[PDB]
């Protein structure tokens, strides 16, 4: 189709070389928002689990300033290998430096790229399979209860049904301590050019889902991209 493998996907969309492209603009909004959540709003703790990391690291760049350990996870093993190639500095890993430096810019140019990169590499110790449909999304791997579960652009796409979505939210809860943070970033797609129907139009329905899944909402913001910060009840 429009990309052949996870690396082709990365080369097509994450090179960050054109400031006015649709991809750069989306990526800047996601990134400003993650900097706000993890650096300004002080969402912080010891263990963060990243759900649907795919082959990308952009969603972890501000987070690694706030969490001691980050576990990266994905349903697709091929996504994880591409990710590992970068973490291990293996040959011909994707070049994340442009996105890395952008984030260093947002954070006030207190650090240059390599130091930031090294801090994320040190934070990441486990690279695991996740299946949001499973009562134990990480299967049989034991992991202490976490202080944060982060899901950027995964849940809406991973769950066709509202009932699937709700169960995933409860499945994710099983990975968290009481009081533990849930950070979702996702899109509420418009009806334009749409074939078939979608979970939401829309703020109210996403909130109800999160609340009824067992969380209290601390904040919800449109960026149709949205960010939501919740705490497990």
């Amino acid at each position: 189709l429009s990309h052949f493998n996870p690396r082709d996907y990365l080369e097509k969309y994450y090179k960050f070389g054109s400031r006015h492209s649709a991809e750069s603009q989306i990526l800047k909004h996601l990134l400003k928002n993650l900097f706000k959540i993890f650096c300004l709003d002080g969402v912080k703790g010891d263990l963060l689990i990243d759900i649907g990391s795919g082959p990308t690291i952009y969603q972890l760049l501000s987070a690694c300033e706030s969490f001691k350990e980050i576990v990266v996870t994905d349903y697709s093993d091929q996504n994880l290998q591409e990710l590992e190639k970068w973490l291990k500095k293996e040959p011909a890993a994707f070049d994340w430096s442009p996105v890395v430096t952008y984030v260093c810019d947002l954070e006030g140019n207190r650090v240059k790229g390599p130091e930031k990169e090294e801090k994320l590499r040190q934070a990441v110790k486990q690279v695991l399979k996740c299946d949001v449909t499973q009562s134990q999304p990480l299967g049989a791997v034991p992991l202490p209860p976490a202080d944060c579960v982060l899901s950027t652009l995964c849940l809406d796409a991973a769950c066709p049904d509202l009932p699937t979505y709700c169960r995933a939210l409860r499945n994710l809860g099983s990975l968290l301590k009481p009081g533990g943070f849930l950070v979702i970033m996702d899109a509420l797609k418009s009806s334009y050019y749409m074939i078939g129907e979608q979970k939401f139009s829309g703020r109210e329905a996403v909130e109800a889902a999160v609340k009824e899944a067992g969380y209290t909402i601390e904040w919800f913001e449109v960026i149709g991209l949205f960010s939501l910060v919740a705490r497990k009840l």
Binding site: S2, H3, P6, Y9, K12, Y13, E23, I26, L27, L30, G52, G54, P55, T56, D74, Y75, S76, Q78, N79, L153, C154, A157, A158, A187
Partner: peptide, 9 residues
């Protein structure tokens, strides 16, 4: 797909 990730995109 962007900004969905494989294999959703």
């Amino acid at each position: 797909g962007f900004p969905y990730k494989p294999x959703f995109c």
